[model samples]
Target: KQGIREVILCKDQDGKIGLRLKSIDNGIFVQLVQANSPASLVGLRFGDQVLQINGENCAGWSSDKAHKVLKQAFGEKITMTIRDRPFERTITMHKDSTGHVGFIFKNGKITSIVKDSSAARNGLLTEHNICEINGQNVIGLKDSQIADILSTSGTVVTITIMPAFIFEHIIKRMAPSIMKSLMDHTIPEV
Candidate 1:
């Protein structure tokens, strides 16, 4: 399923409105945004699909072509059409000062966990989606803002993690790809 949104952006002092978009197999997504830049300030986030650029359709656009569209607009207004994510949630991760929360993150989601880590002890498994930090919605936050939130959580990181049912759905959908990625890896003995 796809949706569309149109937004206008103005250039900043350096003549750039920082937005790093990546071309996925289906479409381009907002991969990164510079802190306090026009892109972040305007509420763009990672994983947001870019449907159009400057009123031109963005379908089948190469990275160079799409970036050129944004790059050429120096000191001028630019418009973009985006498709946002559908659902989001939050979870709270409370830990003592010395407990190790052994988990690996990918695209802000918990992808794996260590057997003896605080996270595993607390019942946090893999495939949990992370939507927020503390009380702030991270969908449109800049990197620095994200870091600030993580560093200042004060031993209690309130992360909005996805539920197990949704994780079940995800596991079914990506099992093939995930298994393929781990096909030749060796598991160490306990």
Candidate 2:
């Protein structure tokens, strides 16, 4: 995700954008971008807060509304405004001869990955919420504890993580007023 990322997506032969989204609070946020999908090809990222879609105000839209707009945009281009968020990633690393995993920890979370280091080669994304190290829960553990665990992990270290964009389910409810308001709305021009 980025700051004010402008994205344009066209439907595949099947007329789909292949983008996953989650409705949180009063806005729809990007959840996942399928590899090789239109969304991915256009550079959309996880945890991007969608502000507008195709010139329509998306700040307080529902999942249904967003999907309808996207489906209606089959042959047209998609324009969106989005903001990015921090992320978490699972990283596995093997120590070098010097027993350094090649990453630094800040406040018990992964802060930086050394270039060409084991952490970098093992696909450690930035800001990973290091949940566990070597099968031991490290939650609330200080950076010092993390370092001690890493030191004791021998030649290999396995890390567990919760990625940055943690999408949550939107519980549905029947609201007569809300239903009426939405039903009376007209489709916006794409």
Candidate 3:
């Protein structure tokens, strides 16, 4: 009963809605919304948990099943009930003398955390996905680029992170290639 939003979207002339939905642990989530797409224009966002499609409850629907329902729905208008991800949070930490944040990240996911480091003391944990650095969105960035940002930022840095399980699922659902690259690339701990 909290933060539930109803969104109405109109499909394009080619019956494209420009939204990618993924199922994670039995919950349907809005994984991706293409730029300027109907879904994007209607306020759909990544990590929104979809509770209903049209008038049908979709709490436990699989991705394929949900796609089928969307594909067959009549008319140009589509209705959805969604709840935004509540676990996202931002953290501020002071860089150590070595300019290290005390964490290792690969493909935007924290792979390990250094002991007693700024990130460790700030409660940063491994397996969290980095969403932003110093208020800049890190989506679609390479590991080297992310590291550069963290290293170049001032003595203090603020970052936003989401659970890796959810973030990885979103990536895997939208672009397997992106996820693959993230997994293949390894970066030094900062």
Q: Which candidate is the best by TM-score?
A: 3
Worst 10 residues of 1 by lDDT: 167-176
Off by over 4 Å in 2: 86-190
Superior candidate under TM-score, 2 versus 3:
3
What's the distance in Å from true for residue 23, model 2? 0.9
**Candidate 1 Cα outliers beyond 4 Å, as residue runs:** 1-4, 85-125, 128-131, 135-190
lDDT of 3: 0.83
lDDT string for model 1 (10-79, tens) is 9887778887666656566665678888887667865567888887887888656778889886538889
Local accuracy of candidate 3 as per-residue lDDT tens digits, 107-184: 888889899998989999778898878977687799999988987899999998898886777778444535756887
Question: Which structure among the candidates has the greatest lDDT?
Answer: 3
Looking at model 3, report the run of 10 residues with the lowest lDDT sum.
Answer: 172-181
Task: Give per-model TM-scores.
Answer: 0.55, 0.50, 0.74
lDDT of 2 by residue, 139-176 (tens): 55788898888888878788876543242222122254
Candidate 3 TM-score, true structure as reference: 0.74
